[PDB]
Amino acid sequence: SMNPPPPETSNPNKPKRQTNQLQYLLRVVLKTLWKHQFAWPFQQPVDAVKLNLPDYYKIIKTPMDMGTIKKRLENNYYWNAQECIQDFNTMFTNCYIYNKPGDDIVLMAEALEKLFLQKINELPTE
Numbered sequence: 001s002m003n004p005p006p007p008e009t010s011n012p013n014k015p016k017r018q019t020n021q022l023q024y025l026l027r028v029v030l031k032t033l034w035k036h037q038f039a040w041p042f043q044q045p046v047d048a049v050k051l052n053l054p055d056y057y058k059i060i061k062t063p064m065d066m067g068t069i070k071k072r073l074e075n076n077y078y079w080n081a082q083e084c085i086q087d088f089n090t091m092f093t094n095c096y097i098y099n100k101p102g103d104d105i106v107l108m109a110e111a112l113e114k115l116f117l118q119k120i121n122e123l124p125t126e
């Protein structure tokens with residue numbers, strides 16, 4: 001069973017805007033998580049073939065990852081902060097759906113999520 005195509009990261013016909021919140025989401029929220037010691041499972045789409053997880057995409061129908069988010073912000077794909085916040089939340093939730101409580105990745109996701117929630121709690125006014 002193969003991997004799906006990655007999520008789209010640009011669309012040349014979408015409108016573009018740069019807002020306070022979108023800047024913060026790339027420069028503060030994504031930056032912080034991306035440079036963290038636990039970012040690496042989350043920096044690219046899950047390759048279920050190379051990572052030997054053949055049921056991954058039987059279970060996870062809305063994949064998401066921070067490499068995709070990073071490119072969506074750099075490309076001005078998002079119009080609203082909430083689109084980006086939703087993507088982060090999808091990413092974390094997928095991890096919690098798929099992986100078992102003993103797995104290190106679960107606690108790594110919990111730690112990153114907590115950082116994420118701190119930074120989103122400080123989302124600058126719109």
Ligand SMILES: CN(C)CCN1CCN(c2nc(NCc3cccc(Cl)c3)c3cc(-c4ccc(=O)n(C)c4)ccc3n2)CC1
Nearest residue numbers: 040041042046047051053094095098099103104105106108
């Ligand atoms: C930090 N340094 C020391 C080592 C880094 N290398 C270890 C071997 N590599 C690796 N090893 C993955 N799984 C194996 C594994 C072994 C031990 C611990 C953990 Cl958390 C994961 C792995 C798992 C995933 C993965 C699996 C399920 C899932 O829901 N998500 C979101 C991500 C992604 C990349 C992955 N890279 C390439 C990177």
